[PDB]
From a paper:
129TASNSS134 was selected as a control sequence as it was computationally predicted to be amyloidogenic but is located in a region not implicated in fibrillation. However, while 45LNIYQY50 (R1), 47IYQYGG52 (R1), and 137VTQVGF142 (R5) formed unbranched and elongated amyloid-like fibrils, the 129TASNSS134 (R4-R5 loop) segment formed scarce and more amorphous structures. The 129TASNSS134 segment from the R4-R5 loop did not bind ThT. Unlike the three spine segments that adopted tightly packed steric zipper architectures, 129TASNSS134 adopted an anti-parallel β-sheet structure lacking a dry interface between mated sheets. The packing of the β-sheets most closely resembled a class 8 steric zipper, with a truncated interface between the two facing β-sheets. In contrast, 129TASNSS134 does not contain any residues that have been shown to act as sequence determinants of CsgA fibrillation, and moreover, Ser133 is nonessential for fibrillation. Furthermore, in agreement with its atypical crystal structure, 129TASNSS134 formed scarce and more amorphous structures, and did not bind ThT. These observations demonstrated that not all segments that are predicted to have high aggregation propensities actually form steric zippers. The R1 segment 47IYQYGG52 and the control segment 129TASNSS134 showed a milder effect on the fibrillation rate of Aβ1–40.
Author numbering: 1 to 6
Write the structure that this text describes.
């Protein structure tokens, strides 16, 4: 899976 935040 993949995730990010900013």
């Amino acid at each position: 899976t993949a995730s990010n935040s900013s």
